[PDB]
Structure 1
Amino acid sequence: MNTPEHMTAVVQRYVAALNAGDLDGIVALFADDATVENPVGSEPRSGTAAIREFYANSLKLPLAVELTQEVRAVANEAAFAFIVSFEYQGRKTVVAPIDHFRFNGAGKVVSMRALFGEKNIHAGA
């Protein structure tokens, strides 16, 4: 069973791996047949290869990632609020999404969706 402690630990590990640029660390949290929809509304990317490619590309820039509130976890799901800060096109940018994870029996993330829109993307020029 997915304990709240496990799902919370996985969310923390995810954020830590992103903040450190640990690609293998991020991918290791996902099932081999998992799906990533980032952002919500974009083409779903499934399978280890597609997931690795997505994060590999995201990590081409140093990302400062931090949780901004307590993790919500119940049943086999977790949701969390956080910020991702980086410099893009010579402008300080802070994105504030809410991510949602679904876990399987092995405690692996089988589906992740990052919900953020244009109004959650803050570029300070």
Structure 2
Amino acid sequence: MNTPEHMTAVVQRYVAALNAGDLDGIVALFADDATVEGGEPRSGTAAIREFYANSLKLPLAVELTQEVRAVANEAAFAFTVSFEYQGRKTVVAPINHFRFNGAGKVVSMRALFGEKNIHAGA
């Protein structure tokens, strides 16, 4: 229609799909003309898949850390993305913003995080 309930569900599908390294599943949440920006922008179904392709090279442990804020045509959520490389666990803690269209597809995704939000040992 769409609704808070729907948008929260999409947020949750998104998180799950990242855990499952399920590219079809992620990309299917976006409109054909959606834009994606995680930081270097990217638009359209193809560019979006490539964006998440690079993201999923290492297996991701992804987790909502608070409730989803969903209202009108937007959703925002806090979460962590954890991965390991050369024996170092890294935890990135961003806040994402979705904008939905009438159909309930994500037409805009923005990831907000800075170096202060990247947590890892030596």
Question: Which band: TM-score by shorter chain?
Answer: over 0.9
Q: TM-score, normalised by structure 2?
A: 0.96
Say what the alpha-carbon RMSD is for the aligned residues.
1.2
CA distance in 1, matches of 2:85, 2:100: 32
Number of residue pairs matched by the alignment = 122
Q: What displacement does 1:123 show? A: 1.5
Matches of 2:94 and 2:54 in 1, distance apart?
A: 18
> Could you say what secondary structure the match of 1:70 adopts?
coil
> Could you state the TM-score of these two structures normalised by the residue count of structure 1?
0.94
SS at match of 2:110: strand
Displacement of 1:44: 1.4
Q: Residues 40-79 of structure 1 correspond to what in structure 2 (within 5 A)?
A: 43-79=40-76
Q: What CA deviation, in whole Å up to 9, does each residue of 1:28-77 have, x standing for no partner?
A: 0000100001xxx8521000111000101111111000100000000000
Q: Secondary structure of the residue that 2:86 maps to in structure 1? A: coil
What is the alpha-carbon distance in structure 1 between the residues aligned to residue 44 and residue 86 of structure 2? 31
Check 1:42–1:65 CA distance in 2 against 1; reply closer, same or farther (3 A cut).
closer
State the percentage of identical aligned residues. 98
Q: Which consecutive aligned stretches of 4+ in structure 1 deviate over 3 angstroms post-superposition? A: none
- Segments of 5+ residues of structure 2 without an aligned counterpart are none
Shift of 1:90: 3.5
Shift of the 27–116 alpha-carbon distance from structure 1 to 2, 3 Å rule, reads same
Partner Cα separation in structure 2 for residue 42 and residue 90 of structure 1: 24
| 1:91 Cα deviation from its structure 2 partner | 1.5
Distance 2:62 2:39 in 1: 22
**Structure 1: where are the runs of 5+ without partners?**
none
